[PDB]
Amino acid sequence: HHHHHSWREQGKPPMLFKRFAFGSYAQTRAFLDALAALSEETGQHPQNINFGTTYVNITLDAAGEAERAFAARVDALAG
Amino acid sequence: HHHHHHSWREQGKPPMLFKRFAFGSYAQTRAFLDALAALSEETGQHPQNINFGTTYVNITLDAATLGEAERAFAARVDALAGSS
Ligand code: NI
Ligand code: NI
């Protein structure tokens, strides 16, 4: 049990989707920088990232244990 | 090479400008994304949405309009992609 907003599983070949919210552009930008660093280190890239000034939508495609662990590393970065 | 000189597309009910940029590698896409963040901070102008993968970036600009401030932002984004 935790207090993070859940990742939603959807689509025929399943995907994990989550919308992260931030209080300002600077907080969104700082998170996107840490998310880029995470993908660069791991070689694991979400299938899609899209963002505005106060939100980041992330979609992870089925490679599973590894997808859930990457979603947990992203949740840890958000807070 | 990919082509970055195509026109921005005008689309949607309150008009928006839309363009997709494609790159040959993650390094090139990432350099463009980092330069786009610097541009937004320089201008204080932020796209409505930036939507990307490892080899492409889709940008949507909203009406402040649409006027010349939005078109000038679009042209500076083209110059970051190598088109001027
Ligand atoms: Ni052409
Ligand atoms: Ni050519």
CSV table of C-alpha atoms in Angstrom, one decimal, chain A:
chain,number,residue,atom,x,y,z
A,1,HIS,CA,0.0,0.0,0.0
A,2,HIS,CA,1.2,3.5,-1.0
A,3,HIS,CA,-0.2,7.0,-1.7
A,4,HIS,CA,1.1,7.5,-5.3
A,5,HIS,CA,-1.6,8.0,-8.0
A,6,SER,CA,-1.9,4.6,-9.8
A,7,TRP,CA,-0.6,3.7,-13.3
A,8,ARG,CA,-3.5,2.6,-15.6
A,9,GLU,CA,-3.1,-0.6,-17.7
A,10,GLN,CA,-4.8,-0.2,-21.1
A,11,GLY,CA,-4.7,-1.3,-24.8
A,12,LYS,CA,-4.7,-4.7,-26.6
A,13,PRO,CA,-0.9,-5.1,-26.3
A,14,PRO,CA,-1.0,-3.6,-22.8
A,15,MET,CA,0.5,-0.3,-21.8
A,16,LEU,CA,1.1,1.4,-18.4
A,17,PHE,CA,-0.1,5.1,-18.5
A,18,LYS,CA,0.2,7.8,-15.8
A,19,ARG,CA,-0.2,11.6,-15.7
A,20,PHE,CA,2.2,13.4,-13.3
A,21,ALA,CA,1.3,16.9,-12.1
A,22,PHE,CA,3.6,19.7,-11.0
A,23,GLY,CA,3.1,23.1,-9.4
A,24,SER,CA,5.1,25.1,-11.9
A,25,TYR,CA,7.1,24.9,-15.2
A,26,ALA,CA,10.4,24.8,-13.2
A,27,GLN,CA,9.2,21.7,-11.3
A,28,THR,CA,7.9,20.0,-14.5
A,29,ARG,CA,11.3,20.8,-16.2
A,30,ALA,CA,13.3,19.4,-13.3
A,31,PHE,CA,11.4,16.2,-13.3
A,32,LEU,CA,11.7,15.8,-17.1
A,33,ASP,CA,15.5,16.3,-16.7
A,34,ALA,CA,15.6,13.5,-14.1
A,35,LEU,CA,13.4,11.3,-16.4
A,36,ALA,CA,15.7,11.8,-19.4
A,37,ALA,CA,18.7,11.0,-17.2
A,38,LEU,CA,17.0,7.8,-16.0
A,39,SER,CA,16.3,6.6,-19.6
A,40,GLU,CA,19.9,7.6,-20.6
A,41,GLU,CA,21.4,5.5,-17.8
A,42,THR,CA,19.2,2.5,-18.2
A,43,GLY,CA,18.6,2.4,-22.0
A,44,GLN,CA,14.9,2.1,-21.1
A,45,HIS,CA,12.8,4.6,-22.9
A,46,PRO,CA,9.0,5.1,-22.3
A,47,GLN,CA,7.1,4.6,-25.6
A,48,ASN,CA,5.7,8.1,-25.2
A,49,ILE,CA,6.2,11.2,-23.1
A,50,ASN,CA,4.1,14.3,-23.6
A,51,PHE,CA,4.0,17.4,-21.5
A,52,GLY,CA,2.8,20.9,-20.8
A,53,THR,CA,3.9,23.5,-18.3
A,54,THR,CA,2.4,21.6,-15.3
A,55,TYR,CA,2.0,17.9,-16.3
A,56,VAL,CA,3.9,15.0,-17.9
A,57,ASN,CA,2.0,12.0,-19.4
A,58,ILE,CA,4.1,8.8,-19.6
A,59,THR,CA,3.3,5.6,-21.5
A,60,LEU,CA,5.3,2.4,-21.0
A,61,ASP,CA,4.9,-0.4,-23.5
A,62,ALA,CA,5.0,-4.1,-22.7
A,63,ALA,CA,8.7,-5.3,-23.2
A,64,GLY,CA,6.1,-7.5,-17.1
A,65,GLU,CA,8.4,-7.2,-14.0
A,66,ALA,CA,10.8,-4.8,-15.7
A,67,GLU,CA,8.1,-2.3,-16.8
A,68,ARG,CA,6.7,-2.2,-13.2
A,69,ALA,CA,10.2,-1.6,-11.8
A,70,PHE,CA,10.8,1.2,-14.3
A,71,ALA,CA,7.3,2.7,-13.3
A,72,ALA,CA,8.5,2.5,-9.6
A,73,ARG,CA,11.8,4.3,-10.5
A,74,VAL,CA,9.7,7.1,-12.2
A,75,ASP,CA,7.3,7.2,-9.2
A,76,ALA,CA,10.3,7.6,-6.8
A,77,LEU,CA,11.6,10.5,-9.0
A,78,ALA,CA,8.2,12.3,-8.8
A,79,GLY,CA,8.3,12.1,-5.0
